[PDB]
Design a protein around this ligand. Structure first.
Ligand SMILES: Nc1ncnc2c1ncn2[C@@H]1O[C@H](COP(=O)(O)OP(=O)(O)NP(=O)(O)O)[C@@H](O)[C@H]1O
Ligand SMILES: Nc1ncnc2c1ncn2[C@@H]1O[C@H](COP(=O)(O)OP(=O)(O)NP(=O)(O)O)[C@@H](O)[C@H]1O
Ligand SMILES: Nc1ncnc2c1ncn2[C@@H]1O[C@H](COP(=O)(O)OP(=O)(O)NP(=O)(O)O)[C@@H](O)[C@H]1O
Lengths: 275, 275, 275
């Protein structure tokens, strides 16, 4: 089993760094969800029942919110929970299906300052033996050592010799990881509201600038997540020089990086960490 | 006459900030109503005839809906009308009886985004000289300057230095007033369906969170209306820190605030506004 | 018109050396600003619309950032723009109101090494005929010869026979002007991040020392801006002897100097320069 599982609970969509031995695939899906099981002859989303929680998940959910073009997202989660649980669940289910396997080596990411809280969160609700019913189909599984990490951290693998900052332009969350050498400057790094959905890239860019005026314009700024490329472009227009987007090697658009990169770079570390 | 009349047309129940010189009393009653005058030897509800509209109003109405435990409420009124008219009428009648007075200084509240529409609505149907027959008893009256305001706004009087959000947990309506300094952020504030009756406080709380992910968890969130206290409690469980319920000074439970608070805080303003 | 306008676009706050014939007054205000016009029945900040840019400016803005106690400042601007434009605009408007006059003799200050860039910046966006709408009120105006100068340079008027260095302890910007005789040693002078807000005076002082170890301890060091006095005091504790704060004659605290001093000393020069 084991199975390194670096999973991103992204507020827009989730994803899974599916190492798959030879090549990392991505177990992704729309993280939009909706409560209540008992709809009727449905299909599309799937009924997820876990920890006394009852949600539909899957593409069709958008139809479930038709007209309510707002509730669709549960963003600015400076922390995991509550719907995040479901996101993780369904992911685990998804990749379970993909692998046909149980016990996961769970590695989660979140806004740096929330990591402690989130560890508490998911440990309580996922650490150890757990089981879920999806669409009437049960599923037992377990995690023994949930590893938490900083959201967007994975971009470091493309961040040439970064001793500075990663900018994570996600859904409605903006992460700033001021990495130095190869660690996280807690005392400087922070997460910013909102993100891509609620306002313009330029709005974010300017917001970022305000929040991190301590950044030298010639810092190596690496932009990841969502509109990473466009964000990078705008940041240049703001006036930052050495700014780059974390191109994810293969045809795996921007927003995929996060977890994929984290696996790609740290992998072995977590093979040791979890084990 | 004059008589400042801040009246709430609440979908569950209405109420009136009865300044009464020395102390604000509340002219409240169940806003459930039913059409058709000609029942027979009745009592309890009262026959209201106004603008060619024909409705019973009053506690006993519940009996009139016995078994139809749904039609009882006319909620999610993102706007005034139509039954709302009657609600207002009977209120005016009620407080008329209470004061023995006519010309009212009408101040109405409604979902912020509907205020313009509602102004049109009530101005057409109430601005100026009007008269109503209740239980066969006529009654002439008038309003000269219907003042419209945002539903739940009144909570601001308890909202210590609020530069953020009021959450109005009503019947089947949820208002979010993102106030800043002392005004309404039109471009951010909005009203949400449904409300207290149709689903759980937690459902609302989570709905709210989805709709306002742009709210920082440390925003001053002031909860008013219906299950204000319980809502506040749940919001804390959701993960909002500085959340408080708008305790209405005296023994005047939650749902009363709205209009009462509006009078309590703005009063003088409207003494100038209406006059 | 003419009107010598030495204006400081300070990241904490702006100011204007209002020569006013007989005595230089200071047209100052908080340089904190926020985008989006359409709030509603507001007052306090004013809606500034210029060059397709849309910002509120004025004291109340702090309330607009309530809780976001960071975004408030857009500092470490090793260059003008973008919000700086607005700062300048509103200043011009402000002093316009103060004088009731248009065509300005614009003199701007900025981090020495950025002066060329900034000239490009403001020339493009302000040189010649321009017009702004503030709170719905239009205003046409013009500048014919924007004069750029080094931020903090004005302190020279108090800097007795300075053949050495001015230290500008501003918001989140630290300027070091190594003046010699009466000019700027480009090859030595430079600007340092961050400034007053982001860390301690001692932190800055030590930072300064590191950046300018080539300064002899007995150099005439003149400290200006923000915590000029405290900075001077700390620098003495660091071990610099002849250090002095640029006391601005009248009751015009530290941070005012910059532009005021620049006018006070160079004035005539610019009367010739601009004309
Ligand atoms: N499944 C998907 N298909 C296509 N584009 C996607 C998909 N998921 C995310 N995106 C892009 O990514 C943008 C938002 O990035 P997002 O997925 O939020 O990043 P994230 O870091 O995974 N989430 P978060 O950081 O929590 O906001 C979306 O607006 C899309 O343009
Ligand atoms: N007359 C009343 N007596 C007791 N409780 C009441 C009464 N009216 C309202 N409530 C409480 O208030 C809850 C609903 O709040 P509500 O009256 O809808 O708030 P509102 O803002 O006045 N109405 P609305 O905003 O239009 O939904 C009810 O479920 C009750 O618990
Ligand atoms: N309007 C004001 N009222 C009171 N104190 C002020 C005001 N403006 C600035 N200060 C003081 O000046 C400090 C910051 O100096 P600052 O205004 O940044 O200098 P500056 O040179 O004009 N700006 P900059 O160089 O761009 O940082 C503040 O922390 C205050 O203590």
């Amino acid at each position: 089993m084991t199975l390194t599982t670096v999973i991103d609970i992204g507020n827009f969509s989730t994803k899974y760094a599916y190492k798959d031995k030879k090549q990392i695939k991505v177990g992704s899906f729309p993280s939009i969800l909706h409560s209540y099981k008992p709809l009727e002859d449905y299909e599309g989303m799937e009924r997820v029942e876990y920890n006394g929680l009852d949600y539909y998940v899957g593409e069709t959910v958008k139809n479930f919110y038709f007209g309510r073009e707002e509730q669709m997202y549960f963003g600015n989660t400076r922390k995991g929970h509550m719907e995040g649980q479901i996101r993780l669940v369904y992911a685990l289910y998804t990749i379970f299906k993909e692998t046909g396997k149980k016990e996961f080596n769970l590695i989660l990411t979140c806004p740096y300052e929330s990591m402690v809280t989130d560890k508490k969160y998911f440990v309580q609700h996922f650490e150890g033996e757990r089981e879920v019913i999806v669409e009437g189909k049960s599923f037992k599984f377990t995690v023994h050592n949930i590893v938490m990490a900083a959201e967007g951290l994975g971009a470091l693998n493309f961040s040439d010799s970064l001793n500075c900052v990663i900018v994570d332009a996600g859904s409605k969350t903006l992460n700033v990881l001021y990495l130095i050498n190869g660690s996280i400057s807690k005392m400087d790094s922070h997460t910013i509201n909102g993100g891509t959905i609620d306002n313009s890239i330029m709005d974010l860019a300017k917001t970022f600038a305000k929040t991190c005026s301590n950044i030298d314009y010639d810092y190596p700024i690496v932009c990841t997540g969502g509109k990473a490329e466009e964000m990078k472009e705008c940041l240049e227009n703001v006036g930052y020089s050495t700014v780059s987007s974390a191109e994810l090697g293969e045809d795996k658009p921007s927003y995929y990086v996060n977890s994929v990169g984290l696996l790609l770079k740290y992998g072995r570390k977590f093979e040791e960490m979890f084990a």
